[PDB]
Amino acid sequence: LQPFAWQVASLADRYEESFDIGAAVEPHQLNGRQGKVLKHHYNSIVAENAMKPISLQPEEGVFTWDGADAIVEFARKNNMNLRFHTLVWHNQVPDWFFLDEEGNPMVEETNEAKRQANKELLLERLETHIKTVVERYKDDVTAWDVVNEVVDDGTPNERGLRESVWYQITGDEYIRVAFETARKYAGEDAKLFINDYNTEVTPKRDHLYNLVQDLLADGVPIDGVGHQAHIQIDWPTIDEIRTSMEMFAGLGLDNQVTELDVSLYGWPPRPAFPTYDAIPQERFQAQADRYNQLFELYEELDADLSSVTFWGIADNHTWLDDRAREYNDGVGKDAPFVFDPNYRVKPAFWRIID
Ligand SMILES: [Mg+2]
Ligand code: NA
């Protein structure tokens, strides 16, 4: 049988000359077998969910720090780096941000002067959320996802910005405010990232590229691009990945791979294998070949890449299962990592440890 993750060489040790090796976690993953894998393999962590806006400030002025603090304390106790995910997102964000002083959605307002009053209110709220959160964690966090998923996959406006509530209310100003406020409160040395998925594919890659150039020219503080890397076995290509990271490096921006998982399924993900034991070993081999090429590329790009984080630990816990179930009538199992649901290594582990 394949040995347990804690019986093989550490990924963080393998890649110590190149970049951090990170995992997304929940508080319950900090102990038991998950915690043993974590301590063995990784030198960086990020909160899967506990640091999202709604997790930290679910009502106006009501902050809930318990889960986030557990993860911070774990990083401190275990000498791990710590990514903060995330100051600004259009998902997992409480609806109170976006209500006017009468308690109605700001997006519905048709009086332009009132829209401008709303924009200032929302930006002030965003400043207060960032200040409060940053002041708590500024000595612990080594990379901030200041904004998440602000760029569109299409082109609904000239700049290719996602038309979330943030954009409808503030245009791009929420993005500027977010970075400026993060810098102000976190300090001159804090590393500030814009994070997104599909950063390897156009038009998105280029909308992102233009946005970071625009903000940089305007003096907005941005240090790096977070590439979520929710990828497949055959897509995106190695060269697409390389080009994107080189493009951002050419601007003087750092790159981090922030939410890496290698799905077994394209889009749409059906038919999915219904259970883990139904997945044929050949699929794990195809995955291992992918992982091999990926990590060769990341090593090749290591002058321009400071951290590689997987969006989870082992195959027993991944949002990809939710995605699989969503497209296959409630049944389906994905397997995106190099450790199996029992914490045993997979073929992919051996192909990235060598
Ligand atoms: Mg290899
Ligand atoms: Na590096």
TrEMBL record:
It catalyses: Endohydrolysis of (1->4)-beta-D-xylosidic linkages in xylans. The active site is at E259 (nucleophile). InterPro entries: GH, GH10, GH10_AS, GH10_dom. One of its GO terms (molecular function) is metal ion binding. Keywords: Carbohydrate metabolism, Glycosidase, Hydrolase, Metal-binding, Polysaccharide degradation, Signal, Xylan degradation. Belongs to the glycosyl hydrolase 10 (cellulase F) family. It comes from Bacillus sp. NG-27. This is Beta-xylanase. Mg(2+) 2 binds at N292, R351, D354. Residues 5-354 form the GH10 domain. Pathway: Glycan degradation; xylan degradation. Its EC number is 3.2.1.8. Mg(2+) 1 binds at S18, D302, L305. PROSITE patterns: GH10_1, GH10_2. SMART domains: Glyco_10. Gene3D superfamilies: Glycosidases. It comes from the Bacteria. GO terms for biological process: xylan catabolic process.
